[PDB]
Write a structure and sequence with these properties.
2 copies of one chain form a homodimer. By secondary structure, chain A is mainly beta. Chain A has one domain: Cathepsin D, subunit A, domain 1 (Beta Barrel). Helices cover 4% and strands 55% of the residues of chain A. At the A-B interface, strand 1, strand 5, strand 6 and strand 9 of A face strand 1, strand 5, strand 6, helix 1 and strand 9 of B. Strand 1 of chain A pairs antiparallel with strand 9 (96-98) of chain B. The complex binds ligand 4UY. Chains A, B: Its main location: host cell. Chains A, B: InterPro entries: Aspartic_peptidase_AS (IPR001969), Peptidase_A2_cat (IPR001995), Peptidase_aspartic_dom_sf (IPR021109), Retropepsin-like_cat_dom (IPR034170), Retropepsins (IPR018061).
Chain lengths: 99, 99
């Protein structure tokens, strides 16, 4: 699709068998999801933004369906105030910014 | 242009006659610039992000060039980790997300 930016670019995702709403975020290097369970091993990570840093769990090789497009990559899980799809998965669905 | 997301979507902006680097950020409602001097009166705003809130100064009807495109609109000034061009100005330059 072509997504205008008058409103937040929110989409439905499927992750870990669960449907969630998430923000398509070109300013995010990484994908950050609210607390949930994911399979496999994880390692701790700190991610920083406006406000400071939060501690997350890093899961590698996670499959997400993003507005119907499958992508695999790293997902960070922790106390984000919004689910964020970052560039590490936006590239895999072919997303570009155009003007 | 068409901006892919394999790298951060960094562009040059011009504000107050000065060139700065900024991130094109679809996840940002608002445009936030590092401490600098802007003309006129300001209003208070709290901005929430991944790791809590920051206080900023809100300046309205500021002239800013973004990757060669003229915009005139609200700029928040404060302790952002990076200059962010949010949707309020991305809509003025005609940016869309496409996949
Ligand atoms: C609610 N208020 C926010 C929304 O609109 C306002 O505009 C400014 C601020 O927006 C944000 O902080 N937006 C976040 C994304 C965002 C969105 C909403 C809440 C939290 C975060 C942004 O798009 C992505 N981030 C960083 C930029 C600040 C550099 S981040 O969430 O901190 C982030 C950092 C590192 C990551 O990987 C290393 C992945 C994500 C305000």
């Amino acid at each position: 699709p072509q997504i205008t930016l008058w409103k937040r670019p929110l989409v439905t995702i499927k992750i870990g068998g669960q449907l969630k709403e998430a923000l398509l975020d070109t300013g995010a290097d990484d994908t950050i999801i609210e607390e949930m369970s994911l399979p496999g091993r994880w390692k701790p990570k700190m991610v920083g933004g406006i406000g400071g840093f939060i501690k997350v769990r890093q899961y590698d090789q996670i499959i997400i369906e993003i507005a119907g497009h499958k992508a695999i990559g790293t997902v960070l899980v922790g106390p984000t105030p919004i689910n964020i799809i970052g560039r590490n998965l936006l590239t895999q669905i072919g997303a570009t910014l155009n003007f």
